[PDB]
């Protein structure tokens, strides 16, 4: 069972700023790592899968990278629409697990 840890847990940032969030795996996930964004009272939305691929209609301001046990999500020049929670999830064998989440506040 791989545990995923996210950092930071919270981050305050202003519109237009550039941020990076980290997801660390307690074991090798072999790039089978996805990211999701969740806004308040809504369900999580897929952003990135297999470490670097953006899902459909995800803005180009988002990018993921990583391998092994370390992964990151970079958000270029934040838009008001980007505030919310961010979660990483692995797909290496089973069970699957999610990191703790990062809360991005304005």
């Amino acid at each position: 069972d791989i545990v995923l840890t996210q950092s930071p847990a919270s981050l305050s940032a202003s519109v237009g700023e550039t941020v990076t969030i980290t997801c660390r795996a307690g074991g090798n996930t072999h790039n089978y790592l996805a990211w999701y964004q969740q806004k308040q009272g809504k369900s999580p939305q897929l952003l990135v899968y297999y470490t670097t691929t953006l899902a459909a209609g995800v803005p180009s301001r988002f990018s993921g990278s990583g391998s092994g046990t370390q992964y990151s999500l970079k958000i270029n020049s934040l838009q008001p629409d980007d505030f919310g929670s961010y979660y990483c999830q692995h797909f290496w064998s089973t069970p699957r697990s999610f990191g703790g989440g990062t809360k991005l506040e304005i």
Partner: protein, 116 residues
């Protein structure tokens, strides 16, 4: 159009059983996986288990002995059942479609409060 809609019991007393229904529209259950995820108040997402298109299942290690997942391909429904509820089982429960290493569509979730 892919649609996932969860219906649950609302409040339930501790030690009872819970059954949640995920009704899917627009795709076939034989073709995709359905994962169950919960969100405890104020906390993150917790992976509960899944059922593959072929009926195999997998579960969270910690909760495995209290969970069962099944589905009715003809009714287009996936079920989640959890025994011996604890008050800390209070959470938002979600079903999500899986395809090619990603949960691409999610239901809006159903809130379950464990109380007596």
């Amino acid at each position: 159009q892919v649609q996932l809609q969860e219906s649950g019991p609302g409040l339930v007393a501790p030690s009872q059983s819970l059954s949640i229904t995920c009704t899917v529209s627009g795709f076939s259950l034989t073709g995709y996986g359905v994962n169950w995820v919960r969100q405890l108040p104020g906390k993150g997402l917790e992976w509960l288990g899944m059922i593959w298109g072929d009926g195999n299942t997998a579960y969270n290690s910690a909760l495995k002995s209290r969970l069962s997942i099944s589905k009715d391909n003809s009714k287009s429904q996936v079920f989640l059942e959890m025994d011996s509820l604890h008050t800390d089982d209070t959470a938002r429960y979600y079903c999500a479609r899986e395809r090619d290493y990603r949960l691409d569509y999610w239901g809006q979730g159903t809130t379950v409060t464990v109380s007596s």
